Amino acid sequence: MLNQELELSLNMAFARAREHRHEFMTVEHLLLALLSNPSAREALEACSVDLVALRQELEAFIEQTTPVLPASEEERDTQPTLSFQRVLQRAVFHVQSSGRNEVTGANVLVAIFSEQESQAAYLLRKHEVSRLDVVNFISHGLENFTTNLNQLARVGGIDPLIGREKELERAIQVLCRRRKNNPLLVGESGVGKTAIAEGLAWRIVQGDVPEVMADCTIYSLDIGAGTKYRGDFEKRFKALLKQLEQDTNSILFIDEIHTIIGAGAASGGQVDAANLIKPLLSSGKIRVIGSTTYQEFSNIFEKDRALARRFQKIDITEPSIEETVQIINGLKPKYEAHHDVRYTAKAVRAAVELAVKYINDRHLPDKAIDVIDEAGARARLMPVSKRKKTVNVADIESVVARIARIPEKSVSQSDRDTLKNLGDRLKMLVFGQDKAIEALTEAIKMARAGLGHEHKPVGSFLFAGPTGVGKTEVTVQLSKALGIELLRFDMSEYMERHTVSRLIGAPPGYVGFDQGGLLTDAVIKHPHAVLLLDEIEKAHPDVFNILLQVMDNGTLTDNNGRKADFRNVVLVMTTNAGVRAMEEIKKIFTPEFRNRLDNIIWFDHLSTDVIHQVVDKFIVELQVQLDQKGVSLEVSQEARNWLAEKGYDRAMGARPMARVIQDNLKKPLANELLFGSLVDGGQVTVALDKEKNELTYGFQSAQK
Numbered sequence: 160m161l162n163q164e165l166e167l168s169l170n171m172a173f174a175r176a177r178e179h180r181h182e183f184m185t186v187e188h189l190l191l192a193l194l195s196n197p198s199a200r201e202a203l204e205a206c207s208v209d210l211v212a213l214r215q216e217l218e219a220f221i222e223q224t225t226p227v228l229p230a231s232e233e234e235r236d237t238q239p240t241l242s243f244q245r246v247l248q249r250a251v252f253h254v255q256s257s258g259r260n261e262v263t264g265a266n267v268l269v270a271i272f273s274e275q276e277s278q279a280a281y282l283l284r285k286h287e288v289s290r291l292d293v294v295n296f297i298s299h300g301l302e303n304f305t306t307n308l309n310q311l312a313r314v315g316g317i318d319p320l321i322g323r324e325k326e327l328e329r330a331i332q333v334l335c336r337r338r339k340n341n342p343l344l345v346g347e348s349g350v351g352k353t354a355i356a357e358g359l360a361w362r363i364v365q366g367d368v369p370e371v372m373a374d375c376t377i378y379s380l381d382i383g384a385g386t387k388y389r390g391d392f393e394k395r396f397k398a399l400l401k402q403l404e405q406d407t408n409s410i411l412f413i414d415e416i417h418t419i420i421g422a423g424a425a426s427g428g429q430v431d432a433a434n435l436i437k438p439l440l441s442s443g444k445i446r447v448i449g450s451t452t453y454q455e456f457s458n459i460f461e462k463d464r465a466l467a468r469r470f471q472k473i474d475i476t477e478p479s480i481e482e483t484v485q486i487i488n489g490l491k492p493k494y495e496a497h498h499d500v501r502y503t504a505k506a507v508r509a510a511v512e513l514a515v516k517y518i519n520d521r522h523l524p525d526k527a528i529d530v531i532d533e534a535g536a537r538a539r540l541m542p543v544s545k546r547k548k549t550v551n552v553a554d555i556e557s558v559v560a561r562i563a564r565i566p567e568k569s570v571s572q573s574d575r576d577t578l579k580n581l582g583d584r585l586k587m588l589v590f591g592q593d594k595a596i597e598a599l600t601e602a603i604k605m606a607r608a609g610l611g612h613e614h615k616p617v618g619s620f621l622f623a624g625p626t627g628v629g630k631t632e633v634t635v636q637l638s639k640a641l642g643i644e645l646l647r648f649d650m651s652e653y654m655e656r657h658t659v660s661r662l663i664g665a666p667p668g669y670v671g672f673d674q675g676g677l678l679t680d681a682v683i684k685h686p687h688a689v690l691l692l693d694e695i696e697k698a699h700p701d702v703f704n705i706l707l708q709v710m711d712n713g714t715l716t717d718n719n720g721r722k723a724d725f726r727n728v729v730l731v732m733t734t735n736a737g738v739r740a741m742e743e744i745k746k747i748f749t750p751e752f753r754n755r756l757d758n759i760i761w762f763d764h765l766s767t768d769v770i771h772q773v774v775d776k777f778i779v780e781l782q783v784q785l786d787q788k789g790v791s792l793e794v795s796q797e798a799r800n801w802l803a804e805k806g807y808d809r810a811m812g813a814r815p816m817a818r819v820i821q822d823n824l825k826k827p828l829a830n831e832l833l834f835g836s837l838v839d840g841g842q843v844t845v846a847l848d849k850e851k852n853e854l855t856y857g858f859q860s861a862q863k
């Protein structure tokens with residue numbers, strides 16, 4: 160009774176339903192199959208129907224609503240619904256009563272119109288295909304950015320909006336109010352705030368929005384944390400608003416509304432320009448849909464108050480797992496057509512569930528769609544594009560793992576050579592503190608070997624010991640040996656309320672300087688770094704609380720929802736407080752603070768031999784400069800003793816050494832190097848006049 164072609168179309172649709180593992184074979188499956196059927200195809204072509212858009216809409220609906228049934232034990236196969244059987248039976252009855260030999264796809268197409276409450280019939284009417292059309296065929300033959308969203312909808316620049324009926328209903332209801340007419344979509348990034356504004360414009364086009372909003376057109380404004388860079392925000396915006404307020408039912412969508420208003424301007428329009436237009440202050444009234452995040456609504460919008468009261472807040476919550484699975488299932492056919500691949504039902508669910516578990520700084524549905532797009536694209540890298548089959552979760556897992564992070568590079572070469580030699584390298588610049596450097600390098604190597612927490616700084620150290628023994632020098636050299644930036648902050652400048660009777664008397668907040676800008680700005684600008692905090696004992700308790708968060712979470716929150724990632728930072732805090740005796744450090748710093756440290760790196764006093772090594776180091780540096788000028792510097796043992804004695808103090812450590820070397824070894828050579836015996840090279844002998852306790856200087860030209 161049915162055509163060969165019809166029966167083939169049925170088999171191909173039956174085939175697709177058992178590989179997608181659909182439990183039901185529906186009327187929408189039938190219409191979809193009819194798109195491959197020659198007679199039904201030609202009928203739809205005669206009515207000028209874009210078969211691809213119909214293909215996409217049917218497939219999307221089928222995937223969102225058809226239950227999948229792959230599991231274990233006693234279960235069932237693919238089964239035609241009562242309605243499906245009803246349609247085919249209606250076609251057979253019509254055809255037999257009409258005097259025709261066989262049922263064709265076009266006859267089934269006529270039968271589908273009688274399924275009044277079906278999605279298939281709904282889509283046919285949406286595409287303006289009338290039942291009569293098939294019967295007649297069977298028998299015979301603002302200026303630039305992303306503006307007019309209504310126009311974008313008429314073509315296909317806007318991706319379809321799945322679900323979120325309640326949110327759309329609430330936005331429409333808000334726009335319909337006499338006062339407080341402006342919806343303010345509030346939600347996290349990636350949740351779908353822009354998608355809802357855009358999805359509304361589509362509803363206006365479809366006429367799925369009541370008569371009062373029929374003439375409405377949604378215009379999106381050219382936005383994208385504070386705007387004021389050349390032109391004239393005052394007149395251009397005024398001319399824009401007058402062109403919108405030009406007697407029309409125009410809705411102005413302003414994405415990221417927290418940009419223009421709430422923060423801080425520099426001009427004289429922004430907040431004040433829009434404020435006039437909302438109620439009435441001209442000869443019209445406009446409506447605005449805003450979009451912002453939860454934190455930007457509470458703070459800069461509601462408290463600083465730009466226009467907060469004129470807006471109606473609509474909470475746009477992150478979709479659930481199942482709601483997101485429905486969203487991906489509804490977009491899936493467009494991704495499959497683009498990537499030439501098929502995503503399994505299990506991969507789709509895995510994309511959503513694994514993104515929820517491991518991509519924690521982002522939100523659904525955005526992060527799940529990115530994973531799906533990325534997995535489809537990844538398939539192109541493998542030869543041509545390996546279709547996939549009854550497994551695909553493993554692909555999703557690789558993609559999610561790449562997004563959740565993996566930045567390696569610590570194996571057989573380059574980094575290995577520096578880490579293995581760090582101890583020795585630092586021991587060449589800093590003496591008398593082998594243990595300190597050893598413990599420091601053991602901790603860097605441990606973290607570089609992938610052993611440690613991901614949500615914590617590379618290392619958190621408290622460098623304790625006496626003044627001028629190598630604490631600052633070690634961290635400065637550590638940063639140069641690692642090849643990373645050195646971010647330095649003095650905690651004596653962050654005590655909050657101690658320095659004022661002198662002249663520097665501007666301490667408002669201080670913690671405000673670390674937060675509101677400095678500390679975070681420096682860490683965002685230099686993710687890989689050594690963060691040195693001098694004299695940590697003088698810091699204000701608010702700084703310590705901030706430091707506890709850094710050591711616990713590896714992140715800071717400041718400068719308007721900014722994230723300072725401390726994951727690749729070596730935190731070093733130096734203290735003089737105890738004076739290495741170790742029990743004194745326990746009293747000064749709380750157990751809570753001390754137990755979050757990876758190590759309290761102890762630094763000892765300098766020996767007489769270490770002080771002599773510091774002197775030699777200063778002398779070699781000078782010899783390097785002098786040797787390049789053909790000048791040989793020799794400093795006698797007694798003179799080295801003299802420099803050691805003068806450049807070291809128990810209370811200052813080796814702090815006075817630089818000055819002492821400069822005054823007694825560098826300055827006395829200046830005249831001879833410029834206009835004396837050393838002009839063309841030569842020798843300098845520095846000795847000690849014993850019973851005078853003063854250095855001796857001998858010169859000889861490169862004229863022996």
Ligand SMILES: Nc1ncnc2c1ncn2[C@@H]1O[C@H](COP(=O)(O)OP(=O)(O)O)[C@@H](O)[C@H]1O
Binds near residue numbers: 349
């Ligand atoms: N309900 C939805 N249906 C289809 N796609 C959605 C839906 N919600 C969000 N998206 C998509 O997820 C991504 C993030 O949505 P978007 O509107 O940009 O989030 P937001 O504006 O809140 O930051 C976009 O690709 C958007 O198309």
Ligand SMILES: Nc1ncnc2c1ncn2[C@@H]1O[C@H](COP(=O)(O)OP(=O)(O)O)[C@@H](O)[C@H]1O
Binds near residue numbers: 589590628633
């Ligand atoms: N351990 C040492 N090895 C080599 N030079 C040192 C050593 N200790 C001090 N110095 C010299 O003295 C100066 C002061 O050292 P520094 O690390 O800044 O002291 P502190 O331990 O108070 O932080 C350094 O710049 C360095 O020139």
Ligand SMILES: [Mg+2]
Binds near residue numbers: 352353354414
């Ligand atoms: Mg957006």
Ligand SMILES: [Mg+2]
Binds near residue numbers: 651652693694
């Ligand atoms: Mg200081």
Ligand SMILES: [Mg+2]
Binds near residue numbers: 630631694734
């Ligand atoms: Mg110090």
